[PDB]
C-alpha cells in the first residue's frame, strides 16, 4: 500500500478510489479459483481419454497436449549442441556445452526483432549462418506435436501475427519440415523450463514438478502420476493455461481491450497476467483517471511497455525523478506531484492483481498432485515479469504463502534465469540418451 | 449524409471516420436480422405451448406473454372514465370520455416526477385525489397477469430503481391489489396502442395489427391468428422485444455502458434502439473524438438527453447557433466550426442505427403474420422519439421501404399521438362490453 | 450384496452383470457430486441477490426460494387448528390440537385420490365439509410466494397434470385466493418438517437446520446464517433440489423414461432418487434382462409401485414367497427360482443409487453451513421412502457415514414420522405469536 | 404407404401406428430446416475467415474443410495410373486407364476386409503388391490438409476403430508420410465424385456443382463463388455435414442407440441417413413392437444389415417369400403374414425418414449458391443407399421435388456409379496438368 499524505485533490481521490475498487482482489474470489482450476484439469484429463486429438473447447478451455518426455533427466552427461529458440520479444541461438554435473555455458550470442514464412525462415537461416561462424528447437506456441521430432502448430497466440498472403503462412504445418528448408527434437517453454531445472538443481532440494513461464505470455507444465491411466505417452502435460474461461473477474478496460485484439474471445486469462497487455491496461486506466488532463500521445496505443511498469514500481529514489523521466520520454507530460501518485497506485494495484492470479493457478496446479501433504516438491519460475522485476517476487511468494497457508513449506519456488534456452539442448539428454 | 466541406483537421477526420464505420449498418445484416427474429419468434410461440407459465430464457429470449384481449373493439360506445398511466418520463392520469364514433376527449391535467412503495403510492394517491376536484390502469413493466384484472410483474427494467428497504419494493406482487391500498383492468403500453389505434382509424385503411412503443423502452404487441392453436386465451400477444440477444452487433461503447447499468446481461436490445441510452452513448462517443479537447462537464454521466440530440438533428438554421445553445448550456464548451460537424456526425450515426433496428423489428413482425402478400394491414406507432422528432419519422419509413420493398404498399404507418392513455379507457370497451 | 449361489444361466448372469454395472457408484463420484452442490447453493444464493424474483436457469438450477419464517418455534404453546394438506400420493385434513410442551395429538381422519380447477376444489371443500362434522395450509409445488398469506406456484411436478381447458387449470395464480372460493399462511412440504422437528423434539439434541423429504418428490430446506447478507427476509430457504443437472450419470433407461414424460428436459435429479419412478425404472431394467422371457403385461407401464419395491427389499421369510406373491398379482409370471434372484439384485441396485444420492445431497448441504465442525447439529428426514422402508434407513446412514467421515457424529439424523401435517400448524405459533 | 388388408390384431395395430408417428416428418420441419443448414453454413463461412485452422464447434458444428483444387477439370487428356481408395465397406485398389474424351476403363480387380497401423499398413501394401502384377490416393475420413500432397486426419468416424496401443494408431499423423513406409494427391470421397462428374458428364447437361455420398458414411462438397473473399484456395469446399446439430428429430431410440456408440455426442445427423445404422435401428423398433414375440437373436446387436433392408423394400414378388428368407436366416423367426406386414411398414417409414433428411440437405446446399434462379445446374449422387436400391432413388427425387417446387427442372441429378476411384486418378490431371 502506497497511501502518499501529500494534499491531492479531493475530487481526482474519489476517480482514483472507484479505479482501484474495480481491480480489488479478495480471497475469498481466490479460493473459488483455485477449485475452478483443479475441476477443469481433472475434466480436461478425462476429455483426453475419450478424444486424443480433438479440443472440443465446450470442454476443458485447456488443450492438455502432450509432451512425449519419459524420462526427467538425471543431469550425468556432456555434450556441445546447437539449438534455437523462438516466440519472446525476440528470438535467440545458443551454442551450449555441458558439464558432467549441474554446471553448464553457452555462447548464444544472437540478435532478433504482409509478411509469409518465407522471408521469415530467410532470416532464421540467415542468422543461424551468421552465428555458425566462431540438437533441438523451440517453438514457443501451441502446437500438436505427434512424437518429439514432428510438431504442428494451431494458431498464432501473443498479439504476433504473421502476414496474410497466398504463401500460406506458418499456421497450419509442421515446423520441422519447413525448417529443414532454412537449413530434431521440438519442444516449448514450459517444458524447457522443467527439464532445465532438473540438470541445474540437485542433491539439496526435492525434486521438481511444475514449470511456469510468466512474461509475453503464461503458460504451465506439470508432472503427473495417472500419465498411465489417461492414454498419452509422457510423463509432463502441457497445459495452455492462457485460455481460462470460467468466472475470472474483468473490468470494462478489458473487454474494450479485448474487442480491439486479432484472437478475439480466445486468450481470456493471458490478457490479464502477462507482460504484453499490462503496459496497454495502465495507459487505459491513465486516462479515465487524469480526464483530459492527459496528452495527445497517451491516447496513442502501444506507448508504454511493462519495462517502464517496472520501473515505476522499483522506485526507491529519494525524490520520484526516476519515474519522471520514464513519464516524460514516454508522454511529454511533466507530471506534477499529484499525479505520480496516482501513476504509481496504478501500476501497483495492476500489477498486484496479476501476480495473485498467478500465485492462484500455481497452487491450484499444486493442489493436484496431492502429493503436498506426504513430502515435498519444487516450483520451477522463469520469465521477464518474475527474475527482472523485484517488486514482483514479493508479492507473489506473499499472496503464495497466504493460498496454501498450512503446507506452505512444502513447495520451494526456484527462479530459473537460464531460461529454455539451455532446456532445448537438454533436449538431446533424452532421445540421444 | 452531412459531408460538409468547411476545412476540417486531417487527422481529427480519422478519429470520426473510425468511429463512424463502427457504428455502420449494412443490409446484407438486416436481412439476416429478419429471418433471427422470425425464428425466435416461432420458437417461442412453441414454448408457451409447453409450460404457459415458465420463462426459461436459454429458449425465445422473447417472454411472449398473453393479453387476455378477446375483442378488438369496433369504436361505436360512449362513457366517461377516470383513468391512471405510468412508465414513461412521466406518470399520467386522464379524465376522458368518448363519443359515438372515433372522436374522443381527455382532461389529462397531470403531473409526475432509497424509497419504497408506501411513499410511491402514497404520491399516486395524493395525486389522483387532487385530480379528483373539477376504468382502467397502465403499468408499462414486464407484467404476468393471469387474467385482465390481475397483474404482477417480475422485475423493473427501464433504468427505474425502487428502494432497496425491508419494505419489499414493488417487483413481487399484483399491482391491482396494492393499488387499493392507495384508492381494474390492467394493460400494457404497447396492447393500448394496438386498441387506440382500432377506435381512433376507421372506415379508410385496412385493420390495424401491430403495435409499437419507441421511446423511454422499445416494445411490441401484434396480433396473431393460430391464438388457438398455442394454448392461451387472447387475440393478441406482448412480445418483450427488449431482450432481443442473438447476434446484435455491438460497438465497445455498448459493452461499457451495459457494465454500468442494473440490468446487467439483460435487455440488450433497448440499450441500442431507446432513448433513455441514445443521449449517453452520443456522449461517450463525443469523448473518444475530441480527445481530451473536451471538458471537465462532459467526462459526467447523463448529462446529454436524447431531446437535446432531437434537437441537434432537427437543425435547419441558417448558421448552427440553434445546437450552440445546446453544446454551451449542457457542457459549457464554446464548439467552434469544426467540431459542430462531429457532433452532427455523431448524433446522425447513432440514431440512424437506432431507427434501421426499430424498421428491422416491425418488418419482421410483420411477415410473421404471412397475410402481407394477400391483403394490407396497419402498424400504429407511437412514441417520444416517433413523433416528436420529424428526422427519425423519414429515416425509418426509408429504412422500412427498403427492407419489405416489393410488398411495401401493403403496410401502412400510422402515427397514434393519442398514447396508451386512450387505452386505459377503451380497455373498459370489452370488459364492460 | 446379494449374491446368491443357486446355479443360475451362464449367460443370464452376463446380462445382469452389464446393467448392475451401469448403475454403480462410486466415492470417487459422490466426492465431486458435493463440490458440484456447493458450488451450485452458493452461486444460486449471489443469483438472488440480484434478482429476487427472476429464475434464469442457465444459473443456478436451484430456484432457491425463501420462505418468510421468521422465527423458529420454541415449542411451548397450545391451541387447537384445522389444516389442510396435498401434494403426496393423496392430500389430508388434520384437526390438530397441541400441548404446552413437545406432545401434539391430531384427528386427521380424511381421504384423497380434462379436469379443471372448479371440480377439484369443490372436491376440496366437500371433503373439508365432510370432516367438519365433528389454522394454515400445505400446498407440495414449487410456489413463489411474496409473503405468508400469499402464494403463486409457477408449474405442476411429480407427475401431477391438470386438465388443459379454457378453465385455466390451476398453475399461474395465487393460491390463497382461488382457496376461498371453495371454503392462511400456506407453506411447503420441506419447511414443514423443519418447522414440525422443533416443537417435537428439544432438550437433548442439538437444533435442527436440514428438513428432507424423500417420498412422491425429493426436496429440502436449510437454514443459512447470512440470510441478512444475500437480501430476502426469511431464516430458512427452501432448494427444489429435484432439479440438479450438472453431471449426475444418466443410464440409458434413464434418457427413454424421460422422453416420455410431461416435464421433459427438467427435474432430472428428481427422476432417479424419487418414488414415483423406481418402480418404473425396475420395470424398464427387469425387460431387458429377462429378454423375451417376460409376460404380456410387463409390457404395460405403470405397473409396478415402489410399495412393492420395499417389499421385495425387506423380504426375510424363509423361502421367498412373499415377492413370489408381489411377481404374481402384478405380472402373471410365476417366476422361477432363477429369475426372483435377477428381481432382488436390480431392486438392491436401484435403490442403492438412489439412497446415495440423497446421502451425497444431505452431506452438500451440511457441508455447506460450515458449523459442523465447531458444534452439532440435527436433520430432521421424512418421506414415504425413508420411513416406511426399514432396508433404505440403513443404507442411507451407511453412506452418509462414509461421505462425512471425521465429522460424523455431529449431524444426526431424526426421522419425522408426524409429516407436514403438523407443520401447516405449527405455522400459526408465529403468525399469532 | 403400404396399407396392407389383412385382418391383423387389433392391439398390435396401435403399437405399429405409434412408433410410425414417431419417426413421421411433415414439410413444416423441413421448411425450417433448410434455412437452419443455410444459416449454419454461411455462419461457417464467416468462421473460416477468422481462424483457418480451428475448428471451435460450438460455432458451425460443420467442419467446412478447404479442397485445395483449383480447376475443375475439362476431361480432355489420357493416361494410365495407379490409384488406392478407403473408407467405405471394404477398400479398393484401380488400375485405371482414360480415353481423349467422358470415356475411361479400369482393371480394379481388388480385395479387403487391438490393431496398430503397421500390421494395417502391411496389409496395404501386400495387396498393392499381388495386384501389381499384372497418380492418386483417397481417405473417406475428416482430414486436414494443408495442401494436396499432405493430409492430416483428426478423428475415426463411421464405426471404425483402431486398436488402442503404444504403437499410436493412425489418428493424429499425415497419411502420405505413413503411407511410403509400405510403398500423391490425397482427397476425399465427395470431392472425388465432384470431379469424376466432371470428367464423365459433358455437352448436354449444365456443369456440376454439387456431390454427396450416401452410404457407410454421409458427406457433402460444393462449389462456392465466394472461395476469395473467404480467404482460403480451392473452388470447392467439403462440408463434413453428418456433424448437424441443431434441432434434427430424435426418437428414443436413437438416444439408446448413440450411447452405446465410441463417438458419443458427435456425428448425430449421421446416425439417422447413413447405411452403417439403418440396419440397427430398423432391429431396435422390430423390439418394441414384436414384444417378447421376438427372438433370443432379435436381441442380439449388428444382426441385420442395411443390404437386407434393401431387399424387404423391393419385394415385388407375388408372395412375401423373398423377405421371409431374409427374416428366416437373419432371426430364425418363421413369420406369420402378421407380422411382415409390420416388418415393411418399419423398414418403410424408417427409409423413408433418411431420404427425406438427405433431399432436405441437398437442397439446402442448393439454394446457397443461388444461381438455381438464373441458371441449371447439376448434383451428382454417389453411394450404396442410392445407385443399389431402387426404391430410395424414386422416394429421394419425389421429396426434392416437393421442396425446391418452382425451381426443380433446374437442379438434374446425376447417378455417378464410377466411386470416387476414377476421382482418385482424375486428380492428376489438375497436378500433372
Given at each position: 500500500?502506497?497511501?502518499?499524505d501529500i494534499?491531492?485533490?479531493?475530487e481526482?481521490?474519489?476517480?482514483?478510489?472507484?479505479?482501484?475498487?474495480?481491480?480489488?482482489?479478495?480471497?475469498?474470489?481466490?479460493?473459488?479459483?483455485?477449485d475452478?482450476?483443479?475441476?477443469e484439469?481433472?475434466?480436461?484429463?478425462?476429455?483426453?481419454?475419450?478424444?486424443?486429438?480433438?479440443?472440443?473447447?465446450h470442454e476443458?478451455?485447456?488443450?492438455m497436449?502432450?509432451?512425449?518426455?519419459?524420462?526427467?533427466?538425471?543431469?550425468?552427461?556432456?555434450?556441445?549442441?546447437?539449438?534455437?529458440?523462438?516466440?519472446?520479444?525476440?528470438?535467440?541461438?545458443?551454442?551450449?556445452?555441458?558439464?558432467?554435473?549441474?554446471?553448464?555455458?553457452?555462447?548464444?550470442?544472437?540478435?532478433?526483432?504482409?509478411?509469409?514464412?518465407?522471408?521469415?525462415?530467410?532470416?532464421?537461416?540467415?542468422?543461424?549462418?551468421?552465428?555458425?561462424?566462431?540438437?533441438?528447437?523451440?517453438?514457443?506456441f501451441?502446437?500438436?506435436?505427434?512424437?518429439?521430432?514432428?510438431?504442428?502448430?494451431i494458431?498464432?497466440?501473443?498479439?504476433?501475427?504473421?502476414?496474410?498472403?497466398?504463401?500460406?503462412?506458418?499456421?497450419?504445418?509442421?515446423?520441422?519440415?519447413?525448417m529443414?528448408?532454412?537449413?530434431?527434437?521440438?519442444?516449448?517453454?514450459?517444458?524447457?523450463?522443467?527439464?532445465?531445472?532438473?540438470?541445474?538443481?540437485?542433491?539439496?532440494?526435492?525434486?521438481?514438478?511444475?514449470?511456469?513461464?510468466?512474461?509475453?505470455?503464461?503458460?504451465?507444465?506439470?508432472?503427473?502420476?495417472?500419465?498411465?491411466?489417461?492414454?498419452?505417452?509422457?510423463?509432463?502435460?502441457?497445459?495452455?493455461?492462457?485460455?481460462?474461461?470460467?468466472?475470472?473477474?474483468?473490468?470494462?478496460?478489458?473487454?474494450?481491450?479485448?474487442?480491439?485484439?486479432?484472437?478475439?474471445?480466445?486468450?481470456?486469462?493471458?490478457?490479464?497476467?502477462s507482460?504484453?497487455?499490462?503496459?496497454?491496461?495502465?495507459?487505459?486506466?491513465?486516462?479515465?483517471?487524469?480526464?483530459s488532463?492527459?496528452?495527445?500521445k497517451?491516447?496513442?496505443?502501444?506507448?508504454?511497455?511493462?519495462?517502464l511498469?517496472?520501473?515505476?514500481?522499483?522506485?526507491?529514489?529519494?525524490?520520484?525523478?526516476?519515474?519522471?523521466?520514464?513519464?516524460?520520454?514516454?508522454?511529454?507530460?511533466?507530471?506534477?506531484?499529484?499525479?505520480?501518485?496516482?501513476?504509481?497506485?496504478?501500476?501497483?494495484?495492476?500489477?498486484?492483481?496479476?501476480?495473485?492470479?498467478?500465485?492462484?493457478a500455481?497452487?491450484?496446479?499444486?493442489?493436484?498432485?496431492?502429493?503436498?501433504?506426504?513430502?515435498?516438491?519444487?516450483?520451477?519460475?522463469?520469465?521477464?515479469?518474475?527474475?527482472?522485476?523485484?517488486?514482483?517476487?514479493?508479492?507473489?511468494?506473499?499472496?503464495?504463502?497466504?493460498?496454501?497457508?498450512?503446507?506452505?513449506?512444502?513447495?520451494?519456488?526456484?527462479?530459473?534465469?537460464?531460461?529454455?534456452?539451455?532446456?532445448?539442448?537438454?533436449?538431446?539428454?533424452?532421445?540421444?540418451?
Amino acid at each position: 500500500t502506497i497511501k502518499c499524505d501529500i494534499p491531492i485533490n479531493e475530487e481526482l481521490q474519489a476517480r482514483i478510489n472507484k479505479h482501484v475498487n474495480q481491480l480489488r482482489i479478495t480471497y475469498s474470489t481466490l479460493e473459488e479459483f483455485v477449485d475452478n482450476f483443479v475441476y477443469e484439469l481433472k475434466k480436461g484429463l478425462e476429455a483426453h481419454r475419450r478424444h486424443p486429438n480433438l479440443w472440443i473447447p465446450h470442454e476443458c478451455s485447456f488443450k492438455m497436449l502432450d509432451s512425449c518426455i519419459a524420462d526427467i533427466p538425471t543431469g550425468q552427461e556432456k555434450g556441445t549442441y546447437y539449438a534455437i529458440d523462438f516466440g519472446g520479444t525476440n528470438f535467440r541461438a545458443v551454442r551450449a556445452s555441458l558439464d558432467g554435473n549441474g554446471k553448464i555455458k553457452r555462447d548464444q550470442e544472437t540478435y532478433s526483432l504482409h509478411a509469409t514464412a518465407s522471408q521469415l525462415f530467410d532470416h532464421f537461416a540467415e542468422r543461424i549462418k551468421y552465428i555458425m561462424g566462431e540438437v533441438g528447437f523451440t517453438f514457443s506456441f501451441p502446437c500438436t506435436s505427434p512424437s518429439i521430432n514432428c510438431s504442428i502448430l494451431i494458431d498464432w497466440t501473443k498479439g504476433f501475427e504473421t502476414g496474410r498472403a497466398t504463401n500460406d503462412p506458418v499456421e497450419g504445418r509442421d515446423v520441422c519440415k519447413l525448417m529443414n528448408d532454412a537449413f530434431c527434437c521440438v519442444v516449448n517453454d514450459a517444458v524447457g523450463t522443467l527439464m532445465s531445472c532438473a540438470y541445474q538443481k540437485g542433491k539439496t532440494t526435492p525434486p521438481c514438478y511444475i514449470g511456469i513461464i510468466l512474461g509475453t505470455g503464461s503458460n504451465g507444465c506439470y508432472y503427473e502420476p495417472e500419465w498411465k491411466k489417461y492414454k498419452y505417452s509422457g510423463k509432463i502435460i502441457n497445459i495452455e493455461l492462457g485460455n481460462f474461461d470460467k468466472d475470472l473477474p474483468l473490468s470494462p478496460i478489458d473487454l474494450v481491450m479485448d474487442w480491439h485484439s486479432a484472437n478475439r474471445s480466445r486468450q481470456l486469462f493471458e490478457k490479464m497476467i502477462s507482460g504484453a497487455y499490462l503496459g496497454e491496461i495502465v495507459r487505459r486506466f491513465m486516462v479515465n483517471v487524469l480526464q483530459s488532463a492527459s496528452s495527445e500521445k497517451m491516447w496513442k496505443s502501444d506507448s508504454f511497455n511493462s519495462e517502464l511498469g517496472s520501473v515505476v514500481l522499483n522506485d526507491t529514489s529519494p525524490n520520484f525523478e526516476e519515474s519522471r523521466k520514464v513519464a516524460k520520454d514516454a508522454w511529454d507530460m511533466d507530471f506534477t506531484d499529484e499525479q505520480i501518485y496516482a501513476l504509481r497506485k496504478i501500476c501497483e494495484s495492476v500489477y498486484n492483481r496479476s501476480a495473485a492470479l498467478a500465485a492462484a493457478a500455481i497452487a491450484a496446479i499444486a493442489k493436484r498432485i496431492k502429493i503436498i501433504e506426504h513430502s515435498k516438491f519444487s516450483c520451477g519460475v522463469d520469465g521477464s515479469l518474475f527474475v527482472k522485476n523485484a517488486w514482483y517476487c514479493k508479492r507473489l511468494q506473499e499472496h503464495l504463502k497466504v493460498i496454501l497457508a498450512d503446507k506452505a513449506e512444502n513447495l520451494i519456488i526456484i527462479p530459473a534465469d537460464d531460461g529454455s534456452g539451455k532446456g532445448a539442448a537438454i533436449t538431446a539428454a533424452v532421445v540421444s540418451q
